[PDB]
Coordinates of C-alpha atoms and ligand atoms in Angstrom, one line a residue:
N2 CA -18.0 13.3 -22.5
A3 CA -21.8 13.2 -21.8
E4 CA -23.8 12.9 -18.5
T5 CA -24.5 9.5 -16.7
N6 CA -26.6 8.6 -13.5
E7 CA -23.9 6.2 -12.3
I8 CA -20.4 7.1 -11.1
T9 CA -18.0 4.8 -13.0
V10 CA -14.9 3.6 -11.1
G11 CA -12.4 1.4 -13.0
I12 CA -10.3 -0.8 -10.7
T13 CA -7.3 -2.8 -11.8
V14 CA -5.9 -5.1 -9.1
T15 CA -3.7 -8.2 -9.0
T16 CA -5.8 -11.3 -8.3
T17 CA -3.6 -13.9 -10.1
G18 CA 0.2 -14.5 -10.1
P19 CA 2.9 -13.7 -7.5
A20 CA 1.0 -10.7 -6.0
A21 CA -2.5 -12.2 -5.7
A22 CA -2.0 -12.1 -1.9
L23 CA -2.3 -8.3 -2.2
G24 CA -5.1 -7.9 -4.9
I25 CA -7.4 -10.5 -3.6
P26 CA -8.2 -8.7 -0.3
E27 CA -8.3 -5.4 -2.2
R28 CA -11.1 -6.9 -4.4
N29 CA -12.8 -8.6 -1.4
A30 CA -12.9 -5.3 0.5
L31 CA -15.0 -3.8 -2.3
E32 CA -18.0 -5.8 -0.9
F33 CA -18.0 -3.4 2.1
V34 CA -17.6 0.0 0.4
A35 CA -20.5 2.5 -0.4
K36 CA -22.7 1.5 -3.3
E37 CA -24.1 5.0 -3.8
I38 CA -22.6 8.4 -3.2
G39 CA -24.7 11.6 -3.2
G40 CA -27.7 9.8 -4.7
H41 CA -25.6 8.3 -7.5
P42 CA -25.0 4.5 -7.9
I43 CA -21.3 3.5 -8.0
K44 CA -20.6 1.2 -11.0
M45 CA -17.2 -0.6 -10.5
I46 CA -15.4 -2.3 -13.3
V47 CA -12.9 -4.6 -11.5
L48 CA -10.2 -6.1 -13.7
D49 CA -7.2 -8.4 -13.0
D50 CA -3.8 -7.2 -14.2
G51 CA -1.7 -10.2 -13.0
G52 CA 0.7 -7.6 -11.6
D53 CA 2.0 -7.0 -15.2
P54 CA 2.6 -3.3 -16.2
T55 CA 1.4 -4.1 -19.8
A56 CA -1.9 -5.5 -18.7
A57 CA -2.4 -2.7 -16.2
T58 CA -1.8 -0.2 -19.0
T59 CA -4.3 -2.1 -21.2
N60 CA -6.9 -2.0 -18.4
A61 CA -6.4 1.7 -17.6
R62 CA -6.7 2.6 -21.3
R63 CA -10.0 0.6 -21.5
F64 CA -11.2 2.7 -18.5
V65 CA -10.4 5.8 -20.5
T66 CA -11.8 4.9 -23.9
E67 CA -14.4 2.3 -23.3
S68 CA -15.7 2.6 -19.7
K69 CA -15.2 6.4 -19.6
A70 CA -14.4 6.1 -15.9
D71 CA -14.9 9.1 -13.5
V72 CA -12.1 7.6 -11.3
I73 CA -9.4 4.9 -11.7
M74 CA -7.9 2.8 -8.8
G75 CA -5.0 0.4 -8.7
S76 CA -2.8 -1.5 -9.0
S77 CA -1.7 -3.8 -6.2
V78 CA 2.0 -3.6 -6.6
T79 CA 4.4 -0.8 -7.7
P80 CA 5.3 -1.5 -11.3
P81 CA 1.7 -1.8 -12.7
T82 CA 0.7 1.2 -10.4
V83 CA 3.3 3.4 -12.2
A84 CA 1.7 2.3 -15.5
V85 CA -1.8 3.2 -14.3
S86 CA -0.7 6.6 -13.0
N87 CA 1.0 7.3 -16.3
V88 CA -2.2 6.6 -18.3
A89 CA -4.5 8.5 -15.8
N90 CA -2.2 11.6 -16.0
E91 CA -2.1 11.6 -19.8
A92 CA -5.8 11.1 -20.0
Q93 CA -6.7 13.5 -17.1
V94 CA -8.6 11.1 -15.0
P95 CA -8.4 11.0 -11.1
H96 CA -6.4 8.1 -9.9
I97 CA -6.1 6.5 -6.5
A98 CA -3.0 4.3 -6.2
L99 CA -3.4 1.1 -4.2
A100 CA 0.4 0.5 -4.1
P101 CA 3.3 2.9 -3.3
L102 CA 4.9 4.7 -6.2
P103 CA 7.4 7.4 -7.1
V104 CA 5.2 10.4 -7.6
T105 CA 7.2 12.5 -10.0
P106 CA 5.9 15.9 -11.4
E107 CA 4.5 14.0 -14.4
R108 CA 2.3 11.9 -12.1
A109 CA 1.4 14.4 -9.4
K110 CA -1.6 16.2 -10.9
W111 CA -4.0 13.2 -11.3
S112 CA -2.8 10.6 -8.8
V113 CA -3.1 10.3 -5.0
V114 CA -1.6 7.3 -3.0
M115 CA -3.3 5.3 -0.3
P116 CA -0.3 3.2 1.0
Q117 CA 2.1 5.0 3.5
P118 CA 5.1 6.7 1.8
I119 CA 8.3 4.6 2.3
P120 CA 10.2 7.1 4.4
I121 CA 7.3 7.2 7.0
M122 CA 7.6 3.4 7.4
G123 CA 11.4 3.5 7.3
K124 CA 11.6 5.9 10.2
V125 CA 9.9 3.5 12.6
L126 CA 12.1 0.6 11.5
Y127 CA 15.3 2.5 11.8
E128 CA 14.4 3.9 15.2
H129 CA 13.8 0.3 16.4
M130 CA 17.1 -0.7 15.0
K131 CA 18.9 2.1 16.8
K132 CA 17.1 1.3 20.1
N133 CA 18.3 -2.3 19.8
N134 CA 22.0 -1.7 19.2
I135 CA 21.9 -2.4 15.4
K136 CA 24.7 -0.8 13.5
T137 CA 25.4 -2.8 10.4
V138 CA 22.5 -3.7 8.0
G139 CA 22.1 -6.0 5.1
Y140 CA 19.4 -5.5 2.4
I141 CA 17.5 -7.9 0.1
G142 CA 14.7 -6.5 -2.1
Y143 CA 13.1 -6.6 -5.6
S144 CA 15.2 -5.5 -8.6
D145 CA 12.5 -3.0 -9.5
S146 CA 11.1 0.4 -8.3
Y147 CA 9.6 -0.9 -5.1
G148 CA 13.0 -2.5 -4.1
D149 CA 14.7 0.8 -5.2
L150 CA 12.4 3.0 -3.0
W151 CA 13.3 1.0 0.1
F152 CA 17.0 0.7 -0.5
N153 CA 17.1 4.4 -1.3
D154 CA 15.4 5.1 2.0
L155 CA 17.8 2.8 3.8
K156 CA 20.8 4.6 2.3
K157 CA 19.3 8.1 2.9
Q158 CA 17.3 8.1 6.1
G159 CA 18.9 4.9 7.6
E160 CA 22.5 6.0 7.3
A161 CA 21.7 9.5 8.5
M162 CA 20.6 7.8 11.7
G163 CA 24.0 6.1 12.2
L164 CA 23.3 2.7 10.4
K165 CA 25.9 1.2 8.0
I166 CA 24.8 -0.8 5.0
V167 CA 27.2 -3.7 4.6
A168 CA 25.4 -5.7 1.9
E169 CA 22.9 -5.2 -0.9
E170 CA 21.1 -8.1 -2.7
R171 CA 18.3 -8.1 -5.2
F172 CA 15.8 -10.7 -6.5
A173 CA 12.9 -10.8 -9.0
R174 CA 9.3 -11.2 -8.1
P175 CA 8.7 -14.6 -9.7
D176 CA 12.0 -16.2 -8.3
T177 CA 11.5 -19.4 -6.3
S178 CA 15.0 -19.3 -4.8
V179 CA 17.2 -16.6 -3.2
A180 CA 20.1 -19.1 -2.3
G181 CA 22.9 -17.1 -3.9
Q182 CA 21.9 -13.8 -2.4
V183 CA 21.2 -15.3 1.1
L184 CA 24.7 -16.8 1.1
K185 CA 26.2 -13.4 0.5
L186 CA 24.0 -11.9 3.3
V187 CA 25.1 -14.5 5.8
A188 CA 28.8 -14.0 4.8
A189 CA 28.5 -10.2 5.4
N190 CA 27.0 -11.0 8.9
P191 CA 25.1 -7.7 9.4
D192 CA 23.5 -7.0 12.8
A193 CA 20.1 -6.8 11.0
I194 CA 18.6 -7.5 7.6
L195 CA 15.9 -5.4 5.9
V196 CA 13.7 -7.2 3.3
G197 CA 12.1 -5.0 0.6
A198 CA 9.3 -7.2 -0.8
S199 CA 5.6 -7.9 -0.3
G200 CA 2.9 -10.6 0.1
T201 CA 4.1 -14.2 -0.1
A202 CA 7.4 -13.3 -1.8
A203 CA 8.5 -11.4 1.4
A204 CA 8.4 -14.8 3.1
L205 CA 11.0 -16.2 0.7
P206 CA 14.1 -14.3 2.1
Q207 CA 12.5 -14.8 5.6
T208 CA 12.6 -18.6 5.4
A209 CA 15.8 -18.7 3.4
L210 CA 17.8 -16.6 5.9
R211 CA 16.6 -18.7 8.9
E212 CA 17.3 -22.0 7.0
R213 CA 20.9 -20.9 6.2
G214 CA 21.6 -20.1 9.9
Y215 CA 21.2 -16.3 10.1
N216 CA 19.9 -15.6 13.6
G217 CA 20.0 -11.7 13.5
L218 CA 17.0 -9.4 13.5
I219 CA 14.9 -9.3 10.3
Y220 CA 12.8 -6.3 9.3
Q221 CA 10.0 -6.3 6.8
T222 CA 8.1 -3.5 5.0
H223 CA 4.3 -2.8 5.0
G224 CA 4.0 -4.8 1.8
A225 CA 4.2 -7.9 4.0
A226 CA 1.4 -7.0 6.4
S227 CA -1.3 -9.8 6.0
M228 CA -1.9 -13.3 7.3
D229 CA -0.3 -14.7 4.1
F230 CA 3.2 -13.8 5.2
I231 CA 2.8 -15.8 8.4
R232 CA 1.2 -18.7 6.6
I233 CA 4.1 -19.1 4.2
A234 CA 7.0 -18.1 6.5
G235 CA 5.8 -20.2 9.4
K236 CA 8.3 -20.5 12.2
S237 CA 10.8 -18.3 10.4
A238 CA 8.4 -15.3 10.9
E239 CA 8.9 -15.4 14.7
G240 CA 10.3 -12.2 16.2
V241 CA 10.2 -10.3 12.8
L242 CA 9.8 -6.6 13.0
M243 CA 7.3 -5.1 10.5
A244 CA 6.0 -1.6 9.6
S245 CA 2.3 -1.5 9.0
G246 CA -0.8 0.8 8.9
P247 CA -3.1 1.2 12.0
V248 CA -5.8 -1.1 10.4
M249 CA -3.9 -4.1 11.8
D250 CA -4.9 -2.9 15.3
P251 CA -8.0 -0.7 15.6
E252 CA -8.8 -2.3 19.1
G253 CA -5.5 -0.8 20.5
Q254 CA -6.1 2.8 19.3
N255 CA -7.5 5.6 21.5
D256 CA -11.3 6.0 21.2
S257 CA -10.3 9.5 20.0
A258 CA -8.2 8.3 17.1
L259 CA -9.9 9.3 13.7
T260 CA -8.6 5.9 12.3
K261 CA -10.4 3.8 14.9
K262 CA -14.0 3.9 13.6
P263 CA -13.1 3.1 9.9
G264 CA -10.7 0.3 10.9
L265 CA -13.3 -1.3 13.2
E266 CA -16.0 -0.9 10.5
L267 CA -13.8 -2.6 7.8
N268 CA -12.4 -5.3 10.0
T269 CA -15.7 -6.2 11.6
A270 CA -17.2 -6.8 8.1
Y271 CA -14.1 -8.3 6.5
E272 CA -13.4 -10.7 9.3
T273 CA -17.0 -11.7 9.8
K274 CA -16.9 -13.0 6.2
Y275 CA -13.3 -14.2 6.0
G276 CA -12.5 -15.3 9.6
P277 CA -10.6 -14.0 12.6
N278 CA -7.3 -12.2 11.8
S279 CA -8.0 -12.1 8.1
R280 CA -7.6 -8.3 8.3
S281 CA -4.8 -6.9 6.0
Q282 CA -2.9 -3.8 5.1
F283 CA -4.3 -4.3 1.6
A284 CA -8.0 -4.5 2.3
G285 CA -7.4 -1.2 4.2
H286 CA -6.3 0.6 1.0
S287 CA -9.2 -0.2 -1.2
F288 CA -11.7 0.5 1.6
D289 CA -9.9 3.8 2.3
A290 CA -10.1 4.7 -1.5
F291 CA -13.8 4.7 -1.0
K292 CA -13.6 6.8 2.2
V293 CA -11.8 9.4 0.1
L294 CA -14.6 9.3 -2.6
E295 CA -17.3 9.6 0.1
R296 CA -15.7 13.0 1.0
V297 CA -14.7 14.3 -2.5
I298 CA -17.6 13.2 -4.7
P299 CA -20.4 15.2 -3.0
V300 CA -18.2 18.3 -3.4
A301 CA -17.6 17.6 -7.1
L302 CA -21.3 17.0 -7.6
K303 CA -21.8 20.7 -6.7
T304 CA -20.1 21.8 -9.9
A305 CA -20.6 18.9 -12.4
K306 CA -22.3 15.7 -13.2
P307 CA -20.8 12.2 -13.5
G308 CA -19.4 11.2 -16.9
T309 CA -18.1 14.6 -17.8
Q310 CA -14.5 16.0 -17.9
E311 CA -15.8 18.9 -15.6
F312 CA -16.6 16.2 -13.0
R313 CA -13.1 14.7 -13.2
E314 CA -11.7 18.2 -12.8
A315 CA -14.0 18.9 -9.8
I316 CA -12.9 15.6 -8.2
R317 CA -9.2 16.6 -8.7
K318 CA -9.8 20.1 -7.1
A319 CA -11.9 18.5 -4.2
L320 CA -8.9 16.3 -3.3
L321 CA -7.0 19.6 -2.6
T322 CA -9.7 21.1 -0.4
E323 CA -11.3 18.2 1.5
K324 CA -8.9 17.8 4.5
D325 CA -8.3 15.4 7.3
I326 CA -10.1 12.5 5.5
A327 CA -10.6 9.9 8.2
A328 CA -9.7 6.3 7.0
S329 CA -8.7 2.9 8.4
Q330 CA -5.0 3.4 7.5
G331 CA -4.5 7.1 8.4
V332 CA -5.9 10.6 8.0
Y333 CA -5.5 12.1 4.5
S334 CA -4.8 15.7 3.5
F335 CA -3.4 16.1 0.0
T336 CA -1.7 19.2 -1.6
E337 CA -0.4 19.9 -5.1
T338 CA 2.9 18.6 -4.0
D339 CA 2.0 16.0 -1.3
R340 CA 0.1 13.2 -3.0
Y341 CA 0.3 10.8 -0.1
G342 CA -1.0 13.2 2.5
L343 CA -0.2 11.1 5.6
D344 CA 1.4 11.7 9.0
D345 CA 2.4 9.8 12.2
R346 CA -1.2 8.5 12.6
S347 CA -0.7 6.2 9.6
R348 CA 1.9 3.8 11.1
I349 CA 2.5 1.2 13.8
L350 CA 5.2 -1.5 14.4
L351 CA 4.3 -5.2 14.5
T352 CA 6.1 -8.4 15.5
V353 CA 5.1 -12.0 15.3
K354 CA 4.8 -14.3 18.3
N355 CA 3.4 -17.8 18.1
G356 CA 2.1 -17.2 14.6
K357 CA 0.1 -14.0 15.5
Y358 CA 0.8 -10.3 14.8
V359 CA 1.6 -8.4 18.0
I360 CA 1.9 -4.7 18.4
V361 CA 5.4 -3.4 19.5
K362 CA 5.0 -0.4 21.9
Ligands
ENO401 O1 5.2 -5.0 -4.3 C1 5.0 -3.8 -4.4 O2 5.7 -3.2 -5.3 C2 4.1 -3.0 -3.6 O3 4.0 -1.8 -3.7 C3 3.5 -3.8 -2.4 C4 2.7 -2.9 -1.4 C5 1.3 -2.9 -1.5 C6 0.6 -2.1 -0.5 C7 1.3 -1.5 0.5 O4 0.6 -0.8 1.4 C8 2.7 -1.5 0.6 C9 3.4 -2.3 -0.4

């Protein structure tokens, strides 16, 4: 509980296994965040969790008892993120989630969330469906809490907008085949299919549906928004509709948009190192986590020094009072009950034409 010069940020991300497509750009983006805030050096401890809730628990606990982190960030996908948020809330350490999660009362005090809440992304997808004469919808998503969040949104927001769910299928993150589920979707013959998945796994139902002769519209979530989806899906990605944060298109934003400068900053640096169109949803989240810390840390430093519980508490209170935090993915304002803090400025709609993401206006 004693004072340190450095600010210690423990980061657990998924750089191996099925979800490496999400964690790798999150870790890469750390090369472009602030190295010092308010005079204090940032010390980052970056760990791999392989996407596994047990490993992510182990890492978050290390951050509490060994590293004595001031802030914890992660994970890259929903199940390990639930695990990190549980640890951070029990231990009373500020936590920035890099994947969506169900923020229950038990998780709300110490966690805020960078990715867009599912219903914000669902709204744009369902409004495109309605505009395009889609009535019946089939669903295929993970058999875990991320897949549940999306299907829940489809049932609640989707149906309230006139849509009819005619089929629900699930698969597991490591599965290499979705043959059985795809055969059921083709048999139900919905007007459109929504896929609830992420990274390279989102390309699995994409290719499988096209291969089995489904020609209807396919809709993807913001978990699929990087170059990896197109690389794996290939031709089967053409004409896909996909929710995404504004970081995929800073060039297209108004000069006035608060998200423009941060998006241009991150993408200029990221894509200079990693090549044209290497921008991703996921790189946006870890970069934005540091945009938030640039705002809240100098405030916290007014009442306490790094390495103390008083500092963690001052960070938590600053997240409530520092408003309109400009970032690459949106403009953040959190409250005691709103831990995502985002509005209409945090979403766009993409499609794919000739292997490139294209904005849908
Ligand atoms: O796979 C999961 O459970 C995820 O949560 C993936 C994900 C990661 C980042 C996003 O901005 C949206 C979705």
